[PDB]
Amino acid sequence: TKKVAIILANEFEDINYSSPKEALENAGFNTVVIGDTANSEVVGKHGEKVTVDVGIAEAKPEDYDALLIPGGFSPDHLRGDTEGRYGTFAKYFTKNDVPTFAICHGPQILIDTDDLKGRTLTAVLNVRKDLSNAGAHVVDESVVVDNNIVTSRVPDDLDDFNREIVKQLQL
Amino acid sequence: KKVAIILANEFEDINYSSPKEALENAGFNTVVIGDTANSEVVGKHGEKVTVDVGIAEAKPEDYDALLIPGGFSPDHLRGDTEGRYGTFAKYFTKNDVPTFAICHGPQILIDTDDLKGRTLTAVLNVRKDLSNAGAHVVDESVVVDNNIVTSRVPDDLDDFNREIVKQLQLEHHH
Numbered sequence: 001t002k003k004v005a006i007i008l009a010n011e012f013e014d015i016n017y018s019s020p021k022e023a024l025e026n027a028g029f030n031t032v033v034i035g036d037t038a039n040s041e042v043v044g045k046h047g048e049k050v051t052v053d054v055g056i057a058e059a060k061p062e063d064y065d066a067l068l069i070p071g072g073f074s075p076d077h078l079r080g081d082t083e084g085r086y087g088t089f090a091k092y093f094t095k096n097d098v099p100t101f102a103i104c105h106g107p108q109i110l111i112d113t114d115d116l117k118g119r120t121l122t123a124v125l126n127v128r129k130d131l132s133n134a135g136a137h138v139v140d141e142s143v144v145v146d147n148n149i150v151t152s153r154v155p156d157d158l159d160d161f162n163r164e165i166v167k168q169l170q171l
Numbered sequence: 172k173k174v175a176i177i178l179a180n181e182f183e184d185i186n187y188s189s190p191k192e193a194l195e196n197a198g199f200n201t202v203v204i205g206d207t208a209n210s211e212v213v214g215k216h217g218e219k220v221t222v223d224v225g226i227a228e229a230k231p232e233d234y235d236a237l238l239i240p241g242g243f244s245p246d247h248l249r250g251d252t253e254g255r256y257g258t259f260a261k262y263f264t265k266n267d268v269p270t271f272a273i274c275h276g277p278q279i280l281i282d283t284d285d286l287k288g289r290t291l292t293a294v295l296n297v298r299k300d301l302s303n304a305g306a307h308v309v310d311e312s313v314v315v316d317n318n319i320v321t322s323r324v325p326d327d328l329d330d331f332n333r334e335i336v337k338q339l340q341l342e343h344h345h
Contacts, residue, residue: 073243073246076243076246076296077296079295079296079297079299080294080295080296082295111299111300111303112299124250125249125250125252126246126247126249126250127249129249129281129282130281130300130303133281133300133303133304134303135303
C-alpha cells in the first residue's frame, strides 16, 4: 500500500488540507501528518483541527510514497524552523524524484530545496516572484505537472490538482 | 514630512504602532496606504487602523519615506492583481528614497526587482527569498544600506526606530 506525507503547521488553508487528503484516501492511499510534535494539534485559518502523526525530528522521508504541502500560512511557519528541517525533509522528495504536490503557498517550501532550477511550476500569485527567483519556469495555470512535481494556485483549482496528484500515485 | 505606510489585514500590530509613534514623536506625519481609502485594516492582535489613501490614488512622489510593517500584511499586499504595491515601492528603490521594513516587510521589496547587491536583514522565514532576489542577507538587529533600513523582529524595534528617525532627520537637515 502507498502512504503520503503531509507537512503542516498552524494556519494552513483548511480546504487545501481536507480536499486533497480526502481525494487521496478515497483512491486508497493513506496520509500521515508531519509537524513539530507528534500528537499535537494544529489549527487551520478557518478553525479546522488536525492531529500531527509524526514529529519532524523523527520523520523518515523514505517511508513515504509522496509529499503534500498544503498552503495558507502553514508554509511560512514551517520555514521558520531554525534548523530548516522541513526544507530538508522536502529535499528528499525533490532530489529523489518522488511525487511532490503543493498548492497555493505550498510551493514556498520547495524553494528551500534549491532543486527548482529549470522546473515548471505554478502557485498563488503572492508567491510567484519568489518561485521565479528560485529559478523555476513559473506559469499561471490551474494545475502544472513537471515530472514528479504537481502544483496548483488556489482552492478553485482543487478538482484539477486532485486528479493529477492521484494520477501520480497510480503511476 | 509624510511617511507612507503600506498596510493590509494581519499586520503585526507593534510593527505598525511602534515605528509610527517614533516617527510622529520626531515630528513626522504618517499616512496609511491600503486597498480602499476610509476602510479599516485589522492586525494579528486586533489593532484597528484606518486607511487614509487608496493604492489606486496613491502617488509615491508625495512621500518622504516608505514604511512596511510585517506580519502577513506584506503577503496580502503581494496578492494585488496589478502588483500595485510592488510598483509603489519601486519608486523608493529606484530613486533612493528612505525605505524602512521590518520582519516580513522586506518581502515587498523583492517585488521591486531592485535588491541585487543590496544588504538587508529580515525575519528568518523570508531570508532565503531575499537571498534568491540577489541581496546580501545578514542576521543583525538593524541594517542600514544607504536608504534601506531593515530589522528582524519586535525585539529590534529600539534599534529600528532609532535608524529610521535618523534617516529622516538627516533628509530634513535636522
